[PDB]
């Protein structure tokens, strides 16, 4: 669908909208929210953006979700998309 950006270490309140609205005030053109059982555990997701430029603006704050603390936030795409 879009660009995409990866996340590992997500908390017991992980949701698709949770993860991308902390990545920043961004708009993923898609999300996949991916975890242990049901959205509560170690989460392991990827999110699909309006370009390396939407997603690199996500690459600005990393540490910033889990009770103020950190997730493996990393690009994996190119602005093609």
DSSP characters over 52-78:
HHHHHHHTT--S-SSSS-----EE---
Q: Report the structure determination method.
A: NMR
First to last CA, the chain: 9
- What is the rounded distance in angstroms from the CA atom of residue 25 to the CA atom of residue 43? 20
Superfamily of segment(s) 1-81: RRM (RNA recognition motif) domain (3.30.70.330)
Cis peptide before 5, with omega less than 30 degrees from 0? no
For residue 4, what are the CA distances in angstroms to 20, 37, 40, 68, 78? 11, 23, 22, 23, 9
Q: Are strands 5-6 and 30-32 parallel, antiparallel or unpaired?
A: unpaired
- What is the rounded distance in angstroms from the CA atom of residue 34 to the CA atom of residue 8? 10
């Amino acid at each position: 669908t879009g660009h995409c950006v990866h996340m590992r270490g997500l908390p017991y309140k992980a949701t698709e909208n949770d993860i991308y609205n902390f990545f920043s005030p961004l708009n993923p053109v898609r999300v996949h929210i991916e975890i242990g059982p049901d959205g509560r555990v170690t989460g392991e997701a990827d999110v699909e953006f309006a370009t390396h430029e939407e997603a690199v603006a996500a690459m600005s704050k990393d540490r910033a979700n889990m009770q103020h603390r950190y997730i493996e936030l990393f690009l994996n795409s190119t602005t093609g998309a």
